[PDB]
Paper text:
With a final aim of obtaining the ternary complex structures of MM_0014 with prenyl donor and acceptor substrates, a cocrystallization of MM_0014 with FPP and Mg2+ was performed using a different crystallization buffer. The asymmetric unit of the P212121 space group contains eight protein molecules that form four homodimers. Each protein molecule possessed an electron density that penetrated the cavity more deeply than the fatty acid ligand did in the substrate-free structure. The shape of the electron density, however, did not fit well with FPP, particularly at the pyrophosphate group. It is also noteworthy that inorganic phosphate was still bound at the supposed prenyl-donor binding site and that no electron density was derived from Mg2+ ion. However, the electron density was obviously longer than farnesol (FOH), which can be produced from the hydrolysis of FPP. Thus, we speculated that the ligand was derived from the prenyltransfer reaction between FPP and glycerol because the crystallization buffer contained glycerol as a cryoprotectant. We constructed models of the possible products from the reaction, i.e., 1-O-farnesyl-sn-glycerol (FG), 2-O-FG, and 3-O-FG, and fitted them with the electron density. A 1:1:1 mixture of the models seemed to fit better than each model, suggesting that different O-prenylation products are formed and bound in MM_0014.
MM_0014 from the methanogenic archaeon Methanosarcina mazei is known as a versatile cis-prenyltransferase that accepts both isopentenyl pyrophosphate and dimethylallyl pyrophosphate as acceptor substrates. Cis-prenyltransferase (cPT) generally catalyzes the consecutive head-to-tail condensation of isoprene units and produces (Z,E-mixed)-polyprenyl pyrophosphates. MA1831 and MM_0014, which are orthologous cPTs from the methanogenic archaea Methanosarcina acetivorans and Methanosarcina mazei, respectively, unusually accept both IPP and DMAPP as prenyl acceptor substrates. The overall structure of MM_0014 is in a ζ-fold, which is similar to those of so far reported cPTs.
Numbering used by the authors:
A (entry chain B): -2 to 145, 147 to 219
B (entry chain A): -3 to 142, 150 to 214
Write the structure that this text describes.
Amino acid sequence: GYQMDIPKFKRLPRHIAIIPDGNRRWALARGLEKHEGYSSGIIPGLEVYDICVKIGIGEVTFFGFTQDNTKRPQIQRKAFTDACIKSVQEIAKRDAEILVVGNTNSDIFPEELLEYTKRTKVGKGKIKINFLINYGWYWDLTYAYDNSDGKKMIENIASAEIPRVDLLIRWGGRCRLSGMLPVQTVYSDIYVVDEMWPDFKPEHLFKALEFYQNQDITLGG
Amino acid sequence: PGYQMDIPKFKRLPRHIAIIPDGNRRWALARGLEKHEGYSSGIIPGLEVYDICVKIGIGEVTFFGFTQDNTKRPQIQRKAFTDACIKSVQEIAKRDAEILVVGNTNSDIFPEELLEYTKRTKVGKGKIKINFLINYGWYWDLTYAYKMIENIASAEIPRVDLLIRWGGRCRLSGMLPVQTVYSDIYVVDEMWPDFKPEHLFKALEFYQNQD
Ligand SMILES: CC(C)=CCC/C(C)=C/CC/C(C)=C/COC(CO)CO
Ligand SMILES: CC(C)=CCC/C(C)=C/CC/C(C)=C/COC(CO)CO
C-alpha cells in the first residue's frame, strides 16, 4: 500500500469485525446521490487490509450487505452489490484466505462471488478475510434449526466457519450490530467511529485497537 | 428548584429498554470493599430506573440479572449476586409492574423464590413490563427451541430498542442475541452502584437523536 507509522500494541484481537457504515450519509453530505457513496468504500477496506497484514491480525470479517438491505431501492442494491463484488476482487489481487458467507440460494447473490463461498487462498495467503454477502442473522440461525441436534445446532449455523469476534468496529457513528453474526458477537467489544466509512483514517483502527487492549475479556465469565 | 432534577420531556421514547447493571465488583474494590459486596448496593439503582421509567411511561424494561456463564464465578460472589437479584424482584413485586423472570429453572443455582415469576405476574396497577434474566444464557435461549426461532426460551420478550450498559464496557455479554440485533447501545462509564438519573436521561437523549 503506502508507508505508515503504526503504533505498538501490548495485546491484539485475533478476529476483527468491520461494519463499514455511513456511505449514503457521506454521499448526501457531498451533494451526491445516496447510492454513490459505496464506490468510495473500497480503498478504505484496502487500507484496513494493509494495516491488519502489517500488525499481524489473523482474521477480519467485513459486513457487505444483508437480506434486510435488499429491501432498499434497486439503484442502492446495485451500488452496494457492485462495491461488494469489487471489494472481494481487490482482496483477490492480494495475499489472503478469502471466504464469502451468505444466502447463495437467491438470484440476489452475485455469481461473481460463488467461487469464494469456500475458503480460497490468493497470493501468499496468511490473513483470513471474510465478507458477509446477502447475509442475514435469521437465515444464519434457522440454517442450524433446519439442518441439525440441540448441542449440534449451534455448531451448524450458516456462518459456522467464522469464529468468535474479539473486536467489532463500526463507522458512521451508530452503536448497533445490525444483525452481524449474533452468535460470534455475544462477547465482542464494540468500538464506534463517528466518521462515515469513506472518511476512514488509520487512526480510526489504531484508536479501536487501543480501546481493545484496555478491555478486561471474560467471554461471559 | 426541587430536591431531584425534573424528568425531561422526550420527543421519541424506546418501547423496550434493556439494562446491563455492570461494574458492581470494580465499584466495591475501588471503595476498599470485597468484590462480592457491590451487588447489594445495586438494588436501589434498579428501583430508581424503575421509578423514572414509570414516570416517563416506558412500556418494557429488561434487567440483566445473572447468566449461567456468571455461575463460573466464586461461590461467595454467586451467593451475593443471586441474593441481590432475589431482593430486586421482591422489591418490584411490592410496586406496580407486570413481572417476568426468564432463565434456566432446571438448576440448583436458579432460586426457588423466583419460580412464581417465570409466568408474567401483574402486581399492583401493572402498567409497566419488568423482565429479569436470572440464570439466563444465550446458548440455552437459542437451543431451547428443540417455528424454532419463535420458540426460543426468551420468546415472550420483544425486540430491544435501547440497551444501556453501566461500567464502561461496550458489549452485550450474551444478553438476548435475537432481540438485540438492531438495538441502539448507550454506555455509561460509571459503575452501576453510582447510577444517577442523568445517566438514563442522557441514554434517552442519545436514543431520540438516532435516525
Ligand atoms: C475489504 C474491502 C476492500 C472492503 C470492505 C468494506 C466493504 C464491503 C465495502 C463495500 C461498500 C459497502 C457495501 C459497505 C457496506 O455498508 C453496509 C452497512 O452500511 C451496507 O450499506
Ligand atoms: C430492578 C432492580 C431493583 C434491580 C435490577 C438490577 C439487579 C438485578 C441488581 C442485583 C445485583 C446486580 C446489579 C446484578 C448485576 O450483575 C450482573 C452484571 O455484571 C452480573 O453479570
